[PDB]
Symmetry: D3
Subunit: 118 residues, 6 copies
Amino acid sequence: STTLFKDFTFEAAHRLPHVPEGHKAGRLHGHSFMVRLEITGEVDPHTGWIIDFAELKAAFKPTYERLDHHYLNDIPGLENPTSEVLAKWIWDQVKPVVPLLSAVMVKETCTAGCIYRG
Amino acid sequence: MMSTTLFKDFTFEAAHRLPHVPEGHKAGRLHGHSFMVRLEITGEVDPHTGWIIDFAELKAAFKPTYERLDHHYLNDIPGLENPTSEVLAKWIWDQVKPVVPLLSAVMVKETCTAGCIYRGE
Amino acid sequence: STTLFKDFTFEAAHRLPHVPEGHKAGRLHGHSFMVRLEITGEVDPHTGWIIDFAELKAAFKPTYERLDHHYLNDIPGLENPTSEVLAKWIWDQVKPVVPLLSAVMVKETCTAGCIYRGE
Amino acid sequence: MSTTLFKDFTFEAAHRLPHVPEGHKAGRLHGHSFMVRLEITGEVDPHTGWIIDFAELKAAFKPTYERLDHHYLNDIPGLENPTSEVLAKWIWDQVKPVVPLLSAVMVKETCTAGCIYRGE
Amino acid sequence: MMSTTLFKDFTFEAAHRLPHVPEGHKAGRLHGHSFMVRLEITGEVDPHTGWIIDFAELKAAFKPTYERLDHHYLNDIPGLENPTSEVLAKWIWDQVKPVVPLLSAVMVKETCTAGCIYRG
Amino acid sequence: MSTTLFKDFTFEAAHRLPHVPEGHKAGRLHGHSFMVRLEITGEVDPHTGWIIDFAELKAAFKPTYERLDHHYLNDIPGLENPTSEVLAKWIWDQVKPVVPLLSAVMVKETCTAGCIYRG
Ligand SMILES: C/C(O)=C(/O)C1=Nc2c(nc(N)[nH]c2=O)NC1
Ligand SMILES: C/C(O)=C(/O)C1=Nc2c(nc(N)[nH]c2=O)NC1
Ligand SMILES: C/C(O)=C(/O)C1=Nc2c(nc(N)[nH]c2=O)NC1
Ligand SMILES: C/C(O)=C(/O)C1=Nc2c(nc(N)[nH]c2=O)NC1
Ligand SMILES: C/C(O)=C(/O)C1=Nc2c(nc(N)[nH]c2=O)NC1
Ligand SMILES: C/C(O)=C(/O)C1=Nc2c(nc(N)[nH]c2=O)NC1
Ligand SMILES: [Zn+2]
Ligand SMILES: [Zn+2]
Ligand SMILES: [Zn+2]
Ligand SMILES: [Zn+2]
Ligand SMILES: [Zn+2]
Ligand SMILES: [Zn+2]
């Protein structure tokens, strides 16, 4: 048994609709968002891996393309695009494709983030 | 386990020395580091806010402790007479857990390549 | 002389209005922008510095707070908010209050950037 | 309650993956700047205020580190299929006997891709 | 002088070995690195596009050379029989300058802490 | 036109700035993980393919590095006012005799700021 992870960065705009009126997050802004997908499972004795890192990247690509260079709030389910909401939303998009998914981390900035484990 | 965790990272610039190491050990000399602290909290996400707590509330809760550490000599702070990573991590937990009840871990990195994670529950 | 620099990070939305339909930069998006301010000058013999890093931060603060947590295209002069335009714009905003400014770098992502020198 | 210590090491090596399909890039001879994080979990001594000195963990790993660094991994027995997963297991198997409090080994082949192994 | 410069960074994973170091020198054993290459260009900013050239255009121009380097053994590429950072930075300049006429410098880093800049 | 080599080193040290005003935070005893970049410029030898081995640059700096690392800077002669600016010049002065091709010294007290000295 082991864990594997792969990291991705996407460039997007968002705003938080439910913060108080003068809160900076309530203004239209953006971030270089980092996403880490983590899987946990058994290592195949012939391949020597769980799945190819490239399969994890390929599995994310359709979701990446929806998020990257986009305004998140216009995506159904991301009307309140906090890191927490986004981590769970990503889990829900990728879990069908990556059944070994064990954690999704979203970082809005280099110093803050959240980790969702479904 | 199933969970949702939030974390926020802070950096502070401080001097320390380790008082119990062998004579001549480099840690025994007055020196310092760019310390990194990561506070992690575990909780439920409110359906209206969409968050556990605002990152800014975490930063504000930590501020008093942060200001005691930054641009200071750690050995002068009570509880930090032996200011190892491990001692500092637990000390920070003890200071913060009262104002951040959902605190689940404290990480302290003395350098970019070496550190400690403390879970106090 | 000696050169000093300091890095600032701001979180902002932008959109490039003059790219072809379909170009990714033409959609409303954002980045965590990095700005490096570089200054060059004489080190005072008594202070041991050119200017305090904090004095540089304070000088930039007004301009920083126009950029951070904002949509760049709404700022006059940033209607086409490329890295190149933004670096020159920051130079033009900051040079009056930091006469020793020698270069401005803007990075939209960690792996690329622009450097402008206005003299 | 628990305390975990960790230290990161970087080594410069070549490898190739022998069991990937014909034209897979990882099947060609190449290399990486590999990063290894060793994590320890255990009691912190009330006198020393640490689990063990970072320097002692470095020393414990040094023999294995020197086998890896500036080498071709496939040549090392046990690393004939030197995936991140296999390497992390292998490092654990070398280091656990010297550092019984070892609780995880992370290997990153690149800055964006990695695996964490936590024992058998 | 008054000027605008752009740069973009690319990382490739490759093996190399230095053939002219003394027997025993670590760099003379087959090994590898996650190499970083930065291309710097300088030119006028077009008043319509607001840019010198699109970052994507610089990436595209470099791709053929990038593909020769990534997931390969450098010593087997003609011109890179002695694949030092110095030699590699110049070799990259020679490959890229014809397709990126605004190219002003090439940086190679073999590790995160050591590298070389060539200006032609 | 030129080939430049560089190598980065990190050392862990205490310092305080003695000529800032009372209550300025840098006036309190503190420390940093300092980063130093040494740069050299010169001809690439066709036989070795290098200017000097990165390992030679590290060895040449080691004595100076060992004075700095895990020490209190203010007690080192020359570093009574251990600003980044003063430190970069001091390192230059210490290193230039054993690294004649030295062309720049950068010092960073934190990851977001620094100083470059070029002689
Ligand atoms: C300041 C800023 O730009 C935001 O996007 C914030 N986002 C969050 C936030 N706190 C949490 N928990 N989650 C968040 O996603 N605070 C601010
Ligand atoms: C070298 C240096 O400057 C220190 O501050 C050291 N600190 C620790 C250490 N080991 C542990 N476990 N914890 C530490 O905090 N070793 C050295
Ligand atoms: C992809 C994206 O989000 C952008 O903002 C781009 N910006 C620039 C760019 N190229 C230059 N030169 N300047 C840029 O500012 N390409 C893309
Ligand atoms: C692309 C490249 O250079 C490789 O070394 C790959 N390695 C792995 C890999 N996938 C897993 N799971 N583990 C690996 O170790 N994919 C590619
Ligand atoms: C240790 C190692 O793996 C190497 O690749 C070395 N490369 C160089 C080197 N020195 C220079 N100047 N250039 C180099 O390219 N030293 C070692
Ligand atoms: C805040 C702090 O800990 C310091 O060490 C400072 N150092 C400098 C500084 N400014 C310059 N120019 N040089 C410095 O070296 N400001 C503060
Ligand atoms: Zn935001
Ligand atoms: Zn220390
Ligand atoms: Zn953009
Ligand atoms: Zn590989
Ligand atoms: Zn090498
Ligand atoms: Zn300081």
